[PDB]
Amino acid sequence: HMADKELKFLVVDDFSTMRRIVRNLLKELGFNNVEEAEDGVDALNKLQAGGYGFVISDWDMPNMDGLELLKTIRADGAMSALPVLMVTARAKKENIIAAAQAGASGYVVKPFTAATLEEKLNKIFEKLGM
Numbered sequence: 001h002m003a004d005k006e007l008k009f010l011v012v013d014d015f016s017t018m019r020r021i022v023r024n025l026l027k028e029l030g031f032n033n034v035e036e037a038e039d040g041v042d043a044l045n046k047l048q049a050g051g052y053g054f055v056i057s058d059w060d061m062p063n064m065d066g067l068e069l070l071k072t073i074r075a076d077g078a079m080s081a082l083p084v085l086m087v088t089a090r091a092k093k094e095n096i097i098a099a100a101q102a103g104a105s106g107y108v109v110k111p112f113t114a115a116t117l118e119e120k121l122n123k124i125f126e127k128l129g130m
C-alpha cells in the first residue's frame with residue numbers, strides 16, 4: 001500500500017505496554033488503522049486474514065518469536081514484500097545481522113524515542129516508495 005492515513009499496521013509484542021507505546025506513536029503520526037498481536041502465531045493469523053500494509057514487531061516472544069515471524073513473512077508468496085520493522089531490546093551486532101539478513105525493513109532498539117520511530121518509519125516509506 002501507500003503511507004496514507006489508511007495504511008493498516010500490525011503491532012506485535014508479548015507485552016501490552018510496548019504495543020501501547022507503538023500504537024500511540026502511530027496515532028500521533030496520523031495512522032489510526034492499527035491492530036495488535038501478542039506473538040508470531042497471533043500475528044500470522046491476522047496477516048493471513050488480509051489487508052495489512054505494515055508490520056512492527058518485537059523479537060523475544062513465546063509461541064513464535066519475531067525473527068521466525070519475519071522469516072515466515074519473507075518466505076510466503078502472498079506477503080513476501082510486507083514491510084517489517086523490528087523493535088527490540090536486542091542490541092548485539094549478531095542479532096542485528098540475523099534480522100537484517102532475514103530481511104528486516106528496519107531495526108529500532110528499545111528503549112526508543114518518538115523521533116527515532118518516526119524517522120525509521122519514514123526511512124522505510126522512502127525506500128519503498130510509499
Ligand code: MOO
Pocket residue numbers: 058059060061087088089090110
Ligand atoms: O522481548 Mo525483546 O526482543 O527482548 O524487546
Ligand SMILES: [Mn+2]
Pocket residue numbers: 013014015058059060061
Ligand atoms: Mn518481548
